[PDB]
Design a protein around this ligand. Structure first.
Ligand SMILES: COc1ccc(C(=O)NCc2cc(C(C)C)no2)cc1OC1CCN(C)CC1
Length: 494
């Protein structure tokens, strides 16, 4: 059942956004602070953000209490503005890896680039999965072909090619579409009372969620993963260092956190509506999306099957076009980081452009393949911050706040963090945990899952190992136990 009208809607809204950007460039009370706050909010908020929030609220075992990524990233923005924006702007860095390049050298920064590249790839895979889900819902095509086509269009749009203040228009379109679809979705006769199902169970488990007494250590272990893992991203620090003054950067960070908190509310409402929906009354029919293994597509479904045809047309086409336009930002950030940091220095402007094109194509292909293999948006969203939290965040803390850090401590903390992360086991990769922390339980798949906060323990172990090995190596080279010819990374001598 191919839908021509949905394709017309997404094309019309995409071109409307494009000509609004052209008009804004054509034009070019001091309201630039609010515009900057909107533009910084639009970096995090997108298809992946709202789709992951709706999926996390929708899934019966997790609910709202486990939908920690929006709140965690808002608190990450607040913490960045409070504590990290000022020291980064004090020393005048250009990119996020520049402190790593200056302190640990180019090689160890190259090793640090791999978790950052993996996190950007996971984030882009989540964005592509959400975009393909929305497009496959509006046009009613197969999920895989929709994902491949949308990723191809985004890759070619990045490859070739105005475009001024487009992020503000994208965020406004997302906001208007979601907040117009919500009142019509709430009034659908299939949807039950949203307040009643928050604390009561009629179709599935209550969407508020419950946390057991034993899970409190794990829940915090997850929450600190999202609150602290969302800080070291390149896209945020680019905007922080682009700001004129440090106080201006702090105010933009606070406004972006407030905007993220506001934009999380319609996604939570859509997830709650999907949790409360009786799908027999709708045109979707049994089985429900969770039995269809289409839970990660809950936001496009609710906007499509619980809203009138004109409201669905307008709002969901606007959301589709805004997500499609905002899908490629992570591609540009990761590819620019690849061109600037590791290729130009560690590994001609025409060569830079050619490598830019090649790495955009490779990043897009890897992201769309990873989107094809996975079956969730919030899972990729959470796993994107995992390696950043384990690896990048302790190194960022050491370079910014710890005086006297070395490449020895960097390497030791890297190895310790990877060891404690891998030996804890990954249920997604069917990796058996080598170290059996107390409280371990077996899931349905037969793989043992850790309930102990081993990820936060890995982060703290990496940080303490960095500090301890750095100062121990300083003492060894000062006292004369190890000669200056023995060193490999030459951290002490330089
Ligand atoms: C709360 O929201 C979620 C909703 C669904 C799922 C889910 O596991 N789906 C199956 C699936 C996984 C994959 C992998 C290849 C990525 N492919 O399919 C995961 C979610 O977050 C988890 C995040 C870590 N931890 C806290 C537990 C929850």
């Amino acid at each position: 059942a191919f839908h021509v009208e949905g394709l017309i809607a997404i094309i019309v809204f995409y071109l409307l956004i494009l000509l609004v950007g052209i008009w804004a460039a054509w034009r070019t009370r001091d309201i630039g602070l609010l515009v900057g706050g909107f533009t910084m909010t639009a970096t995090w908020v997108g298809g992946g953000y709202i789709n992951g929030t709706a999926e996390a609220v929708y899934v019966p075992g997790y609910g709202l209490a486990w939908a920690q990524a929006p709140i965690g990233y808002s608190l990450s923005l607040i913490l960045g503005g409070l504590f990290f924006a000022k020291p980064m702007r004090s020393k005048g860095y250009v990119t996020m890896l520049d402190p790593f390049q200056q302190i640990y050298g180019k090689r160890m920064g190259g090793l640090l680039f791999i978790p950052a590249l993996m996190g950007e790839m996971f984030w882009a895979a989540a964005i592509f999965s959400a975009l393909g889900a929305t497009i496959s819902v509006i046009i009613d095509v197969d999920m895989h072909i929709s994902v491949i086509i949308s990723a191809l269009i985004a890759t070619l749009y990045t490859l070739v090619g105005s475009v001024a203040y487009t992020d503000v228009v994208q965020l406004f379109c997302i906001f208007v579409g979601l907040w117009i679809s919500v009142p019509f979705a709430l009034s659908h006769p299939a949807v039950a009372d949203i307040g009643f199902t928050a604390v009561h169970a009629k179709y599935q488990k209550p969407w508020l969620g419950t946390v057991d007494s034993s899970e409190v250590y794990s829940w915090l272990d997850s929450f600190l993963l999202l609150m602290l893992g969302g800080i070291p991203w390149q896209a945020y620090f680019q905007r922080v260092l682009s700001s004129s003054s440090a106080t201006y950067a702090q105010v933009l960070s606070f406004l972006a956190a407030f905007g993220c908190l506001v934009m999380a509310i319609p996604a939570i409402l859509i997830g709650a509506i999907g949790a409360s929906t009786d799908w027999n009354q709708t045109a979707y029919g049994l089985p429900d999306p969770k039995t269809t293994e289409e839970a990660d597509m809950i936001l496009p479904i609710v906007l499509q099957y619980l809203c009138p045809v004109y409201i669905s047309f307008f709002g969901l086409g606007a959301v589709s076009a805004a997500v499609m336009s905002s899908a490629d930002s992570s591609i540009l950030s990761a590819s620019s980081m690849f061109a600037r940091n590791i290729y130009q220095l560690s590994f001609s402007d025409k060569e830079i452009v050619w490598v830019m094109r090649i790495t955009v194509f490779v990043f897009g292909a890897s992201a769309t393949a990873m989107a094809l293999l996975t079956k969730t948006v919030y899972g990729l969203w959470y796993l994107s911050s995992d390696l950043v939290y384990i690896v990048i965040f302790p190194q960022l803390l050491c370079v910014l706040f710890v005086k006297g850090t070395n490449t020895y401590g960097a390497v030791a903390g890297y190895v310790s963090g990877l060891f404690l992360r891998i030996t804890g086991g990954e249920p997604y990769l069917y990796l058996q945990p080598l170290i059996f922390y107390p409280g371990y339980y077996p899931d349905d798949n037969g793989i043992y899952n850790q309930k102990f906060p081993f990820k936060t323990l890995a982060m703290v172990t990496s940080f303490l190992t960095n500090i301890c090995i750095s100062y121990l190596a300083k003492y060894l080279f000062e006292s004369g136990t190890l000669p200056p010819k023995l060193d490999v990374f030459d951290a002490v001598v330089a």
